[PDB]
Design a protein around this ligand. Structure first.
Ligand code: HEM
Ligand code: HEM
Ligand SMILES: Cc1cc(N)nc(COc2cc(CCN3CCC3)cc(F)c2F)c1
Ligand SMILES: Cc1cc(N)nc(COc2cc(CCN3CCC3)cc(F)c2F)c1
Ligand SMILES: C[C@H](O)[C@H](O)[C@H]1CNc2nc(N)[nH]c(=O)c2N1
Ligand SMILES: C[C@H](O)[C@H](O)[C@H]1CNc2nc(N)[nH]c(=O)c2N1
Ligand SMILES: [Zn+2]
Lengths: 415, 415
């Protein structure tokens, strides 16, 4: 088919033929839709040689087709050359160019990502020569420094060697390079970030000297070629942080919150031409809601709506006073304010969602489509006053892609 | 299968086997998901006699199974009796009991409805004896009065005769029984409600004396047995309205807004046992966001975020001041306040979404499932601070159901 998606705020219509090239499955059948299951058996990530050539063939056929050298001799030699090498070694290696293309297009194809207008502006750091945890720590530190750029943030990805057998496997055990620690208390309450409490304990299991407080930058746990991971502390000077004040409430400093500048997802798996990159941390800059709404106000995250309402002196008795809503807008005004007053790159959820629509336009004109996940594109506050609420989005799974993968501490055969 | 849905705020898991009894299709394939297309060719509504018996059989098999008389003689006689009548007339008629059951279960199965905890408490008004537009006006007026109950709102539905040939067809041309008018201006701007401007013109086409202002209660356009529709004005005393003030801002009265108490969708189609009820207006009470967020603040609806921000004296220059968000919480505090201070039934979006989770529990315990549409369940503001943001929902199409249908003024062969 050649499906149509509509915007109901603007009566704009686009036509999607890109979904035809789609390959992977979604979890939805004809009789059930599953667009709200968080981690489906599809989106989560062992492969053989027979399976491997079509995936190389397909990938190389789009990559040459993109530089305007489709199916020619430079193409067919390269198809022959990897075909041969996949006979010989049963796997193969990517040209430096094929890696940059594959990486940028895994982001371009990430349907849950609102910020994809910047997909082509991605710095690829090739760390396929890495052998040790120390080498990983060094590539990662150089990633942080470059991406952070003293607050003028830049998108980057660092790609450690691809999985081979499966038991020799590079992994960053952190879910993000920079996260705050999470400790449980005597009464059972939680200090820091409740999300990471299990991870924080694994780091103490391996000998972390926790400064058992709130915003405690976790160390890195780096697994190299299947070996047992090792702890490393990012130099504090390389960890940029923003203290959250408000442009009205002088008591907002007293709240005493802060966040890190650099969102940098490290636990994902990067698929290119059938090869699997189990360590591939990637970074950009924050949309405000990801801190102000989710990090700070999720019930099982920092859960600050309590204290902020109290200090605003709010009708906190009734549910229908909307005191939760009132304090969520102020918390998000203060996150934005703080970040921009410190020259640290941040986008508000209005600006970013307007850009995604602009982006969808381009993707539909110059590519014939753009897979998008409305459940995840719409910002977690003020949904319908942002234009993506009113935009129909076809979700489908293209490749190259980022995929979820099981946490290594269940998989990793220890020793 | 026997699928599992998770809540990620509470780590609660439910098992869904109800989807197995599902019948209709959703629009999603294995390779595409379409859970964000507004009106899919599925959800929109001509049927023959061969098709008709299985649908009667299936419906009667669940209805007797519910009163604890599954497949017995009272059952088999009734299956024989409608089978015979479907031979004879090629259609059939529903027992008063089968109509109440079918109606309540069309609501129970409406996966986009957040308020379904009250599905069993539904007043069914059987208007299948109606022959004229005047009879329709009278059934509808009695609906409004009963449902409104002087602000203590009650759920009701009024069911005009089922479609037969297709060209003799009862329709309420209004989309809701009570809506405000929409007129265009000289400069092209819009007074009233821009949604209805086409409808408002059709009513003036048929001779409405528009009081060309804002909150102008539209007249009813009633089509009876295929005949050309006729205009009727609900008695003003039967149209309950709530003037919107704020519990801080004395200037909020000066804004000069008001809304009607009774949400009452009239343009839907009710499917029961294979029979199609083209006129079936149904009502309950409002969730606040439906007025404060969508009606009042949609760009192509009343679009009041401008004036409210101005009066709050807001940093309206930058996008990232979040002035749009700030004025949306106040507008929604004032809608709730006003409605409850006037003893008119209204639910806030926190209260209603907590109830839907409680409801989902019951539906999964005592029925094995509950189809839900996350795109439409999550409230259009403060999504993630309400528990339905964190709840995975399987969407699937059961029957009896409400279905969309084309507007009659394109279909109706005039004269
Ligand atoms: C440029 C600034 C960026 C912004 C503002 C941004 C924003 C977001 C947001 C809000 C989400 C939803 C996830 C959540 O809310 O927790 C997301 C998802 C995602 N983004 Fe982006 N992102 C950016 C850059 C990047 C980069 C550089 C990459 C890859 C190189 C990337 C790939 C992804 C992926 C894979 C997902 C998740 C898809 C899934 O879970 O299946 N993003 N992003
Ligand atoms: C009891 C109070 C009720 C509340 C608070 C409520 C709330 C809602 C909301 C917020 C929606 C989403 C639509 C939108 O936002 O525009 C919805 C949809 C819907 N509701 Fe309910 N509703 C109520 C009663 C009812 C009743 C009495 C019926 C039927 C007898 C019903 C059947 C439906 C249907 C069919 C839909 C739309 C599904 C679709 O578009 O496919 N609801 N409701
Ligand atoms: C580079 C970047 C910039 C930015 N601003 N935000 C992000 C967050 O992206 C991601 C978030 C998650 C976590 C899913 N959530 C935790 C439970 C649900 C997984 C991913 F794979 C992402 F890519 C990334
Ligand atoms: C009884 C009741 C109570 C309440 N509080 N709200 C509603 C609204 O329900 C509905 C809304 C729509 C319109 C869809 N929108 C317009 C463009 C998108 C269609 C339906 F079929 C509904 F049922 C109904
Ligand atoms: C159950 C549901 O799928 C889950 O809460 C999703 C909903 N949409 C989301 N959207 C974003 N951007 N991030 C999220 O974590 C989620 N969580
Ligand atoms: C494009 C999208 O499907 C459309 O805007 C939907 C999204 N979710 C919704 N949810 C509700 N409750 N009401 C709506 O009108 C919509 N609109
Ligand atoms: Zn789907």
């Amino acid at each position: 088919r050649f499906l149509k998606v509509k915007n109901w705020e603007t009566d704009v219509v686009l036509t999607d033929t890109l979904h035809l090239k789609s390959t992977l499955e979604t979890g939805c059948t004809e009789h059930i839709c599953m667009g709200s299951i968080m981690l489906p058996s599809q989106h989560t990530r062992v492969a053989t040689k027979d399976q491997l050539f079509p995936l190389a063939k397909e990938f190389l056929d789009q990559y040459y087709s993109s530089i305007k050298r489709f199916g020619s001799k430079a193409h067919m030699d390269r198809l022959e050359e990897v075909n041969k090498e996949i006979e010989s070694t049963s796997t193969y290696q990517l040209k430096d160019t094929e890696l940059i293309y594959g990486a940028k297009h895994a982001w371009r194809n990430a349907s849950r990502c609102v910020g994809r207008i910047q997909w082509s502006k991605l710095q690829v750091f090739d760390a396929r020569d890495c052998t040790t945890a120390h080498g990983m720590f060094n590539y990662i530190c150089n990633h942080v420094k470059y991406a952070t750029n003293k607050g003028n943030l830049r998108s980057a990805i660092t790609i450690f060697p691809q999985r081979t057998d499966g038991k020799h496997d590079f992994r960053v055990w952190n879910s993000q390079l920079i996260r705050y620690a999470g400790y449980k208390q005597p009464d059972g309450s939680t200090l820091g970030d409740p999300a990471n409490v299990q991870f924080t304990e694994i780091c103490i299991q391996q000998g972390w000297k926790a400064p058992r407080g709130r915003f405690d930058v976790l160390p890195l746990l780096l697994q190299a070629n299947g070996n047992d991971p090792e702890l490393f502390q990012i130099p504090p000077e390389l960890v940029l942080e923003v203290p959250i004040r408000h442009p009205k409430f002088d008591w907002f400093k007293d709240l005493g919150l802060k966040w890190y500048g650099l969102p940098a997802v490290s636990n994902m798996l990067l698929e290119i031409g059938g090869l699997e990159f189990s360590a591939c941390p990637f970074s950009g800059w924050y949309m405000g809601t990801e801190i102000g709404v989710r990090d700070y106000c999720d019930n099982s995250r920092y859960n600050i709506l309590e204290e902020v309402a109290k200090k605003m002196d709010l009708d906190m008795r009734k549910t229908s006073s909307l005191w939760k809503d009132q304090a969520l807008v102020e918390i998000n005004i203060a996150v934005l304010y703080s970040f921009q007053s410190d020259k640290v790159t941040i986008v508000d959820h209005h600006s970013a969602t307007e850009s995604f629509i602009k982006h969808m336009e381009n993707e539909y004109r110059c590519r014939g489509g753009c897979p998008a996940d409305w459940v995840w594109i719409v910002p977690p506050m003020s949904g319908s006053i942002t234009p993506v609420f009113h935009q129909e989005m076809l979700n489908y799974r293209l490749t190259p892609s980022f995929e979820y993968q099981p946490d290594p501490w269940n998989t990793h055969v220890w020793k």
